[PDB]
Design a protein around this ligand. Sequence first.
Ligand SMILES: O=C(Nc1cncc2ccccc12)[C@@H]1CCOc2cc(Cl)c(Cl)cc21
Lengths: 305, 302
Amino acid sequence: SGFRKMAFPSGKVEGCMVQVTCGTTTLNGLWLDDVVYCPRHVICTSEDMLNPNYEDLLIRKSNHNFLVQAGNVQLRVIGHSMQNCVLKLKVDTANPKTPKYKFVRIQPGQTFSVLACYNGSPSGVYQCAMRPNFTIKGSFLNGSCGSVGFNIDYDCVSFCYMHHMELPTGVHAGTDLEGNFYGPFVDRQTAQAAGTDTTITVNVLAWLYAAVINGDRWFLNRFTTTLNDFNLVAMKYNYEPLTQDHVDILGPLSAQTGIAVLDMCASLKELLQNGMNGRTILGSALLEDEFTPFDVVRQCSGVTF
Amino acid sequence: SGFRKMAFPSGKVEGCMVQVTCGTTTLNGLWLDDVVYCPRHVICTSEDMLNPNYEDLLIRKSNHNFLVQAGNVQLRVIGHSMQNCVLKLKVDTANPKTPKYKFVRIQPGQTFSVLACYNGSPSGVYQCAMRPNFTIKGSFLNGSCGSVGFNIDYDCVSFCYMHHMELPTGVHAGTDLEGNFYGPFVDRQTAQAAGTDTTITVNVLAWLYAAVINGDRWFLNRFTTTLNDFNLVAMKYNYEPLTQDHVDILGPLSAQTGIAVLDMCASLKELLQNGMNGRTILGSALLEDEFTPFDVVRQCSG
Ligand SMILES: O=C(Nc1cncc2ccccc12)[C@@H]1CCOc2cc(Cl)c(Cl)cc21
């Protein structure tokens, strides 16, 4: 029993974290095989950030300008190239701790674990979701750039996020490991704002199934709804539309608990229109949307890595 | 900016997780140097749950009855001893991945990370607090026994908890790494119940300081209170008494935000009286009590 916000074990990623220093800037890098990946803004000054020409800034740099440190060992940079908003520093040594890995781009609503790092040293791990507005509600301080987000499937680490910046509202923006930003963000000091966020409907439904599996049933009702009527109500409450794909993904949880997805949708509709009335679900007075259906199945069945 | 429930990176503990099998029972063990620590109930059968005599059950066992597996390598048990509710299995190989470590017994309100494991394999990492009733609200299934709780301040792992059992209400009980249970619990299937749980007041106050540091001030008020008047109010909401130790511990956060502890206590009294009125604090509609003053300082300042 119990349902916690749970991250993947971070060990495979910890053995990849290195510190990258360029001039006065120090941030984190991801050391996989003989390449160190890090945000390209490490080559910027405070002035450069206002209007940066990264090809021009990078061409002026030499390999010895990049100081890479893996623990207490300085790595030798033997090449440098840029791929979108990520800098790739070729090093002379392949990381002996390189796990089986892939670079994957996640969709909004998908969750992942973040290994927050400072000076190439892991300090914490937390689970979060890629918001529908492409930001993440992380917890990051100065020096956390280059910290990565990942999932584990079997013994393979799928790297899906690299931290680049904090927006004025305190939310975070970054890229996949190919340097493509999630969202309409750019790595330049200019006016940028997160769009209005919405609730990840499929994830709230998955969390209501987790609550039922854990014995919390007060919100269940005798009713069902059509997918179209549910989506009309979802649009009204700034909830993401629920697709037939989402309904299909929730199938196993529906089969296990005996609550059809549209029956759970009718519970969610009543919760949106009437509130919780002083009650809680899994120790929360708000509907939680940072557990995917896969996360609920994984946690309620005990899959290991 | 931002405030998340954050666990320590679990790598140093992952390299210590092994599978321990004794008869039909399989659970997790912690492999440090040449010793594997695990719950002593791994030696129990069906009739040895209601009233087990662990000394008598252990004396009947030989080293070859304990099957220890570290990855895909079977470890050889060369000795066994019991220390309170933990079984210590001496093995013929020292764990090469043994980090710098300590065994620390914690107090209620303290937080720690749990590396939940099944069959010696880590499945997830989450953050817990030792409840005032000495239980933990973990997330554990059958086979999670032997999973450990830890903190990693510096490069040293302080092991503080080993999971032993789930109580009828779905909460969890366990021991420190010396086998001493937290709380009035025993490793017997006898009728046991968690006492009435209370809110960790000092932790809620720390989390209100984290909210102020993060820019949230709506709950602040112009009132202060005496420590005794605060305790008389807070007890009525099943909150733990706030001691002078707790007030002292909150000093650095009070100095940083400019809000005296008793001034923050008056905000907490008002939040208990009024509720949140549709508002949230750090993305929560409930007062959070699983961040200590130490966690808040570390997460907010470094
Ligand atoms: O609690 C137990 N293991 C579990 C742990 N955590 C979570 C669980 C969730 C579901 C089912 C088992 C779970 C075992 C088996 C059941 O009976 C006992 C009894 C005693 Cl006295 C002791 Cl010390 C251990 C156990």
